[PDB]
RNA sequence: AAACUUUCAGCAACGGAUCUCUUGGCUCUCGCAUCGAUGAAGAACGCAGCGAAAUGCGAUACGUAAUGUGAAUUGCAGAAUUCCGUGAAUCAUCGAAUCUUUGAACGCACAUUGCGCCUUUGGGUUCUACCAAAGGCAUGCCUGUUUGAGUGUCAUU
RNA sequence: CGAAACCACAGCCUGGGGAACGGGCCAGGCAAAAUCAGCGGGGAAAGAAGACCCUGUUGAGCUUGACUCUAGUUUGACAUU
RNA sequence: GAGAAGCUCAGACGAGUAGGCAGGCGUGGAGGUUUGUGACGAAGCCUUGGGCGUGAGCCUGGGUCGAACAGCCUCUAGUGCAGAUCUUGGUGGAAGUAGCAAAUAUUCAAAUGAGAACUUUGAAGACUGAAGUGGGGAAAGGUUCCAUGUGAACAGCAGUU
RNA sequence: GUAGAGAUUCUGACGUGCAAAUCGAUCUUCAAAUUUGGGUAUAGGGGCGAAAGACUAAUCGAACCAUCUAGUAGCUGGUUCC
RNA sequence: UUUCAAUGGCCCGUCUUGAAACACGGACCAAGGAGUCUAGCAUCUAUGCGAGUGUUUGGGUGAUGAAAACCCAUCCGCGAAAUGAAAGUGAAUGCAGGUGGGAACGCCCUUGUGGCGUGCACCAUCGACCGACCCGGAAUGGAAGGGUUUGAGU
RNA sequence: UUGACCUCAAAUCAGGUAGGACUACGCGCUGAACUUAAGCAUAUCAAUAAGCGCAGGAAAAGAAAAUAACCAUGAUUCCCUCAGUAACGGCGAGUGAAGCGGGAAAAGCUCAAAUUUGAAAUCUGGCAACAUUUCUUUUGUUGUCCGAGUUGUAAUUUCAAGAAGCUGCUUUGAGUGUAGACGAUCGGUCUAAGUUCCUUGGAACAGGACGUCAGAGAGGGUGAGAACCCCGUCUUUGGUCGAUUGGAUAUGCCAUAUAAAGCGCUUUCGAAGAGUCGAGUUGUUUGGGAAUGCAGCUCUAAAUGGGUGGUAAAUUUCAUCUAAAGCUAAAUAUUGGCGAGAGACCGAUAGCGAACAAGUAGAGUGAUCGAAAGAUGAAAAGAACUUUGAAAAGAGAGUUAAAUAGUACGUGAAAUUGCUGAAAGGGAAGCAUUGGAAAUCAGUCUUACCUGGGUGAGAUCAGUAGUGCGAGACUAUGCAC
């Protein structure tokens, strides 16, 4: 149960705020759990995904596949993973989008800001 | 047309009354607002009482002159007889009513007694902290916001 | 209520008779589908509804204070009757006693785990499991209006002092917690049905006489309130009908069924 | 006997009911007080690599400065002179700026991109014509300034 | 290539009765697919909530020595004085 | 025992407009309840199958379909249609019918083209006949002007224009 | 008598039209109280009228637009399950 | 279920004395489509309390989470008194009366639709009491005595 | 002649200021008719719609020329009550307040009338310096000079008083940084837990098994109903900034603080708003009745005067207030704007006109008028390629869980239509009753239970023994074989 007068449980408002979220807000909405080894190492449960992150797919027809994140299509709340594609009619391979909540990160694209995000989030390096 | 039993009808609804219908859907909201304002005011003026002391007066007319109720403020004669200057009265929460007068000794004595009881229970803080002056108190440590009706009820 | 201007915001007038058209008002002008179409009427598309709803409909209903207190007294009395608890759907087959009263240490519980373990010890947790299994998506358009899930009611926990008991119990499905001084008919007779399963703390249970009083002694917490008297002193009428004092003066029983 | 007509069913049409949905409406409550001659509200015309309507913006034109975030945008691209970085983004936020023609609208007009005046600075031979740029020129009223008017009232020559 | 009006359902006559002139009711005459061009007897054919008439405690335009008022106009008083 | 709101025995009676009352049927939403139904197919819809009720209605087989929905006790209402020259939308018979007949008028060959009564070129026959079917403007329109392409829609037949 | 301006008769065509006033023939006037563009003035109990209650944007014995207004109706129509 | 045969069956809705009407509406189908809500009043019913009754004008637990529930003071409304235009005055002779019918109960018969005694409710009726009014009636007061009357009274 | 003063001008003079918009709520002006009265004119609708002026976060009102008639009350506003009452009304239809009482909130004051007269003690502007800041954007201080001002700017007073004198009394406003906290907030996070197994499925977020957290089982997202996948939800501190004498020993200290208020006896006093009050009259308005308020015009005051005291007048008393000048928070309003949380509301002919590029397209000279229109799929995977065709397309194929989802896309009703099948048909058809014919549907019977018969094997059954006293049921150790 919520108690704050500043929190809305309106289905209409929550759906409007989710599908109308701006680009920077959608980054936090597209978060993935860290792997078990990574959770212990960095003391962090989950992070916003990023291009050049290493994931494995945990749900769906592509469950068990691995690869880099080639792009984060935030307009569609979708991740594009390397070598996760399907065949078009004409033989061209079309990438298949996967929700960020349906992957787990196995290796982080660590960099200065990401390192700062781990310490800020209470984690360790 | 009129053919049923009962009173001849009287309903005053020939103007555009639906334009000026007043509903009370905000009644609990107003009640909460007013309580919050009282709580905000009490914390702001503390430790002064939230309500000022009022005189006891007899209501006019034969329908209510057997009763006693709070009045607006103490008369100039009542303040004089209780040894309180009218300019000082307001500074310590004693309202002054320049309009009301004392036509009888009973009204005067009753309200002079209310002022004397108020003054005896009153703790006046010195204008400069830690330098008590005349008319002030030297035991201000136990000062708290208390109801005047708890000390001086209308009897 | 609908908006007071709904269906009124047009210039339409009746075109009168002689045009081989119904006499309903119609939009003037031209160049758009709306032009010439009927307007305002409760039978017209984009007209005004019949008798538009108003905000000053009576929404709230007054009940006499004494009847309200009668209702709560009946609801509390029903909570002491194991048959009514079972009839109202509460899984109370294994609880040790009705009324069910637990120690005042429950008022100081800090965690949901302790509250859960207490419910299991007094065999009240089967009622909670009933609530969890019953949870479903609501049928109909209520699910579009912030009323998505429905479920059964669990035990009502009544305390005297809140030293953490409210926070320890509130996340458990179907459980409600209430101070003994503010008993609510909406909780004691949910849906209007008597027999809510209630768990009392010792201090709350020991305050009921000061809350409700008796038929001859005024309630301490309800000025001038006395419990109602019943119109029948002994409600076991089957016993009375078959009692010695009655059976010894009646006529011979007569045939229950007769041959044709 | 067919064709034809009529009814029913299957299938196919025509049409868009029904059901389910819903970033919309409606209604209630709570909170707040902030437009404009320092040019508002409104209007016009423009601005993007490929953009007409909407959003945004104003020749610094889907924006500049500043702050936060921290790799996107995405329909196609393009840009890897950057991605462990004062740096992507139609991102968020926002205390500095820019802010076309208008509009109360203010040099006079206006079915006219019509017709003038002033100051300074430049151009072309031009202290007076012409061209360009910058800054200016409405009305009523108030306080004050300056310059005046009166066979209004006076003092001294 | 391609409308529309109109359309309760329909469509062969005589007599009867009947809201007193029926396509349907009752009794007769009768009765055979699918169609074309014409026609103006019938469908009391269509159109338009009769425009005549009456009723309405429903209007409007117009008239007048109707009822009640009114711009204006005229005369007086007072003020301006 | 026989939902005592139950059970049992008996007699008489049955038109109905306007109107009155009672008991029921069905619809949206609310509280309660039913280890309620459901992607192993909810709701909805079709049916040349079955069952129940005097009836309002209800249950069910088969088909279609894809995400919700129902029973029981109560609460509640914007709750039930054949009509209103009713509203909005869709769609009929009339019908391949009425008709597409003012302004004299077209014809031959070639080219192009999938296709030519209607395009283009040449030839013939004609017309406006200078108060023009000619050559310009004002008002009004606003790109309709020109070239290159296209030929779904429009040009009430056609289309390569 | 032609251009122009009209509109007598056929009670012609048409009369779900080429057209919410047109088409044909016939006819009236044709150098003035003539016809007409543009500019300008007059606005609704008002205008304007060589006077027909005419004309005032297919509207006239009082235009058109919005509002009062869901105007009132002893009158007509309708008024939904067993 | 379809169809055939035999017998019967006019087109519904409406206003109407009377509709199959040569009375009006209705070509077809879907979806929409009309006794509502509010301020009162009246009867009837249910519930609570009862010479009382009505917590929601307000104030409090209250901050947590609170439009709910729950609690709490003074007023006030309606009722506990009428009558009169008003100034005013204001309800027991008596078991709070008598008479008739009468529910329920008790007692006697003697098997009848009985007699006897209390008598609820209600109705009819004779009085008493309060107010108004009309009387005489021994400056101000109207006490005892009255009245064919009068009141939405006791 | 000049100068002064007065009055009046001018300037693109130095510096300011007003207008327009928003109108839900607020203060005024102006002002209908429909309507009701079963007609209709007064009345009503209505001191309303429309028209015009003018504001704010609220406005307006407001510290009595107020009530009352009491044992009196005591600015204003709002609520409940008074009360559908007193009253008004073709006394018809209709209309209709106030004092008291309870409650919300409370707060009180400023001028003009006075000789500072041993001292215009007052103010604006320019210039200069010095400070100050939500702020180089803000706001002042001092000096100096010039203007204003004696036709009066200050100071004490405002009737509740008060002033001048007689006589006796105590003594106060500003900077620094701590802790306690508090407004914008935050590098915004310590804040918890399954994405294990089986089945179905394209997809698990479904069912089952096994676990977990819960101060978090609100809501939303994610390939189907997810507390534990994601955002959040719940709970609770530590980094700043600014209001920071607001409170504390507010310490530690600034040095405010030398002359201004309180009561106290006695005096003589005590200025108090004019074309206004009031009267008449006309119009309007009100519940206001021989005038409730407002306005025009005529007349026009007073000094214990004047107003009010709800029946006109004359007189006499009594009570109460103190007009004709001014300010003021709160409690109250709020269909506009902005931000937020909800709902027994509507669910695409509904709900705003507008769920969608809607005040849009479109109409009208103009004022104005003003729509229609939501849904492939989890994902375009939006159908390669072959073939027939001038092409549009078709047919094979292909994708998909599904093309009975192909964008003319969820479901896909009815009217209406084509094909196929069935059947019937001499100037309608439809319906009812009864059967024929044809078509089609259901009986699943004789299952259960009981007994007899055949063989078969088996921990073997009635009375009992023992383990709550009398009687009855049950299980359990054995015997009964
Ligand atoms: Mg509507
Ligand atoms: Mg449904
Ligand atoms: Mg006929
Ligand atoms: Mg007629
Ligand atoms: Mg009957
Ligand atoms: Mg509804
Ligand atoms: Mg199904
Ligand atoms: Mg069918
Ligand atoms: Mg049956
Ligand atoms: Mg309805
Ligand atoms: Mg229908
Ligand atoms: Mg009907
Ligand atoms: Mg119709
Ligand atoms: Mg033809
Ligand atoms: Mg010729
Ligand atoms: Mg010729
Ligand atoms: Mg030319
Ligand atoms: Mg003719
Ligand atoms: Mg109506
Ligand atoms: Mg009307
Ligand atoms: Mg027959
Ligand atoms: Mg009749
Ligand atoms: Mg009929
Ligand atoms: Mg008729
Ligand atoms: Mg008729
Ligand atoms: Mg018809
Ligand atoms: Mg319907
Ligand atoms: Mg009338
Ligand atoms: Mg009438
Ligand atoms: Mg009339
Ligand atoms: Mg107005
Ligand atoms: Mg403002
Ligand atoms: Mg104000
Ligand atoms: Mg005063
Ligand atoms: Mg009135
Ligand atoms: Mg005065
Ligand atoms: Mg007026
Ligand atoms: Mg499917």
């Amino acid at each position: 149960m919520k108690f704050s007068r500043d929190v809305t449980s309106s289905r209409r408002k929550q759906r409007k705020a989710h599908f109308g979220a701006p680009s920077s807000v959608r980054r936090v909405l597209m978060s993935a759990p860290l792997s078990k080894e990574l959770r212990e190492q960095y003391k962090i449960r989950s992070l916003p995904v990023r291009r050049d992150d290493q994931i494995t797919v945990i749900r769906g027809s592509n469950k068990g596949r691995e690869g880099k994140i080639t792009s984060v299509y935030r307009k569609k709340f979708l991740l594009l993973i390397e070598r996760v594609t399907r065949e078009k009619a004409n033989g061209a391979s079309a990438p298949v989008g996967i929700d960020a909540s349906k992957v787990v990160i196995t290796k982080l694209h660590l960099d200065k800001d990401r390192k700062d995000l781990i310490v800020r989030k209470g984690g360790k390096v | 047309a009129i053919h049923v039993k009962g009173q001849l009808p009287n309903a005053h609804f020939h103007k555009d009354w639906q334009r000026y219908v007043k509903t009370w859907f905000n009644q609990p909201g107003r009640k909460l607002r007013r309580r919050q304002a009282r709580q905000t005011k009490a914390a702001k003026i503390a430790p002064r009482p939230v309500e000022a002391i009022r005189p006891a007066v007899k209501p006019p007319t034969i329908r209510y002159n057997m009763k006693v109720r709070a009045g607006r403020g103490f008369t100039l004669e009542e303040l004089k007889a209780a040894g309180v200057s009218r300019r000082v009265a307001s500074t310590i929460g004693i309202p002054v009513d320049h309009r009301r007068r004392n036509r009888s000794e009973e009204s005067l004595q009753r309200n002079v007694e209310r002022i004397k009881v108020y003054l005896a229970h009153l703790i006046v803080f010195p204008r400069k902290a830690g330098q008590p002056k005349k008319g002030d108190a030297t035991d201000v440590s136990g000062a708290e916001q208390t109801d005047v009706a708890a000390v001086l009820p209308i009897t | 209520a609908v908006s007071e201007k709904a269906g009124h915001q047009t210039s339409a007038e009746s075109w009168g008779t002689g045009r081989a058209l119904a006499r309903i008002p119609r939009v003037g002008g031209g160049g758009t589908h709306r032009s010439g179409q009927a307007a305002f009427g409760n039978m017209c598309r984009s007209g005004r509804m019949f008798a538009p709803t108003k905000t000053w409909r009576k929404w709230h209903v007054k009940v006499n204070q004494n009847e309200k207190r009668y209702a709560i007294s009946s609801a509390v009395a029903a909570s002491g009757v194991p048959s009514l608890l079972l009839a109202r759907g509460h899984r109370i087959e294994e609880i040790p006693e009705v009324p069910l009263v637990v120690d005042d240490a429950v008022q100081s519980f800090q965690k949901t785990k302790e509250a859960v373990a207490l419910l299991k010890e007094i065999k009240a947790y089967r009622d909670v499991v009933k609530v969890a299994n019953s949870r479903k998506l609501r049928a109909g358009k209520g699910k579009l209006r912030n009323r998505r899930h429905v479920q059964r009611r669990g035990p009502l926990v009544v305390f005297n002092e809140d030293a953490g008991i409210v926070k320890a119990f509130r996340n458990i499905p179907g459980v409600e917690i209430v101070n003994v001084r503010r008993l609510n008919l909406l909780q004691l007779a949910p849906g209007g049905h008597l027999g809510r399963f209630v768990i009392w703390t010792k201090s709350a249970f020991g305050l009921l006489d000061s809350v409700f009083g008796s038929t001859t002694e005024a309630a301490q917490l309800k000025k001038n309130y006395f419990l109602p008297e019943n119109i029948i002193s002994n409600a076991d009428v089957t016993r009375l009908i078959n009692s010695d004092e009655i059976q010894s003066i009646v006529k011979a029983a007569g045939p229950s069924r007769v041959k044709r």
Side-chain angles (χ1 to χ4, degrees), chain C residues 214-235:
Chain C
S214 68
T215 66
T216 56
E217 294 251 34
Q220 189 195 51
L221 298 183
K222 287 173 186 159
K223 258 193 63 94
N224 305 325
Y225 179 70
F226 301 81
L227 282 173
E229 302 256 15
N230 211 345
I231 63 171
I232 179 164
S233 80
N234 176 32

Side-chain angles (χ1 to χ4, degrees), chain A residues 87-104:
Chain A
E87 313 293 317
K88 262 197 297 171
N90 75 315
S93 59
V96 171
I98 315 271
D99 206 73
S101 58
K102 264 54 201 162
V103 315
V104 56

Side-chain angles (χ1 to χ4, degrees), chain C residues 42-222:
Chain C
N42 63 302
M43 72 291 294
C44 303
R45 181 186 179 277
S46 77
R48 176 216 62 247
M49 72 183 294
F50 157 74
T53 50
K54 311 292 192 183
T55 57
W56 54 83
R57 183 209 304 261
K58 279 180 292 209
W59 306 99
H60 307 77
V61 181
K62 174 186 172 170
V63 181
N64 293 342
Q65 175 168 50
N66 198 72
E67 289 193 36
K68 287 172 147 189
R69 294 168 165 175
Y70 202 136
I72 297 176
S73 291
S74 292
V76 173
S79 76
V81 187
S83 294
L84 303 183
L85 302 194
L86 288 169
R88 225 205 67 79
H90 290 296
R91 312 297 200 257
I92 62 111
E93 302 88 4
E94 301 314 313
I95 68 169
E97 194 177 350
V98 170
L100 189 43
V101 192
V102 299
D103 194 56
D104 277 334
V106 180
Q107 291 182 160
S108 301
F109 276 1
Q110 299 297 295
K111 304 284 294 181
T112 312
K113 294 239 183 301
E114 316 169 57
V116 170
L118 172 74
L119 293 177
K120 292 183 176 177
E121 282 300 330
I122 61 188
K123 330 295 298 203
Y125 204 60
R126 284 113 298 290
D127 212 43
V128 166
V129 174
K130 169 206 72 182
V131 170
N133 296 339
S134 78
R135 181 166 148 102
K136 276 176 182 292
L137 185 67
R138 173 187 298 269
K141 295 194 162 297
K143 81 171 81 59
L144 275 60
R145 305 167 182 183
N146 312 320
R147 296 191 298 277
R148 268 193 93 80
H149 292 287
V150 300
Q151 67 191 25
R152 307 292 83 73
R153 308 285 279 267
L156 175 63
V157 174
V158 178
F159 68 94
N160 177 70
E161 296 176 351
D162 179 28
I165 180 174
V166 169
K167 67 183 188 188
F169 275 91
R170 68 188 181 186
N171 211 44
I172 304 175
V175 171
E176 306 178 78
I177 323 105
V178 64
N179 195 289
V180 69
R181 280 154 275 250
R182 53 178 68 206
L183 290 176
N184 197 329
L185 188 69
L186 302 182
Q187 299 170 322
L188 289 169
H193 299 322
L194 293 155
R196 178 72 183 264
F197 177 30
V198 180
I199 300 171
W200 314 84
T201 68
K202 178 198 186 303
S203 293
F205 196 76
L207 207 68
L208 279 179
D209 280 321
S210 113
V211 165
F212 288 98
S214 68
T215 66
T216 56
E217 294 251 34
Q220 189 195 51
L221 298 183
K222 287 173 186 159

Side-chain angles (χ1 to χ4, degrees), chain B residues 77-150:
Chain B
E77 319 94 83
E78 289 166 359
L79 293 159
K80 176 72 133 273
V84 183
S85 160
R86 62 178 290 185
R87 316 300 174 186
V88 169
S90 60
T91 69
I92 57 179
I94 302 179
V96 181
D97 195 329
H98 62 94
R99 285 175 294 263
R100 190 168 60 85
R101 55 220 70 169
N102 298 106
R103 284 171 172 81
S104 61
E105 293 291 333
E106 283 80 5
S107 67
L108 174 72
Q109 289 311 310
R110 166 173 44 242
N111 288 316
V112 158
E113 295 314 307
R114 287 182 71 80
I115 305 171
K116 287 200 194 296
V117 173
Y118 182 80
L119 291 172
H121 289 259
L122 176 80
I123 299 164
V124 188
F125 289 67
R127 266 267 269 102
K128 183 167 185 173
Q131 310 285 345
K133 240 43 184 162
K134 196 168 292 175
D136 302 346
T138 60
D139 196 20
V140 294
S141 66
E144 72 175 9
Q145 200 166 61
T146 83
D147 298 40
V148 184

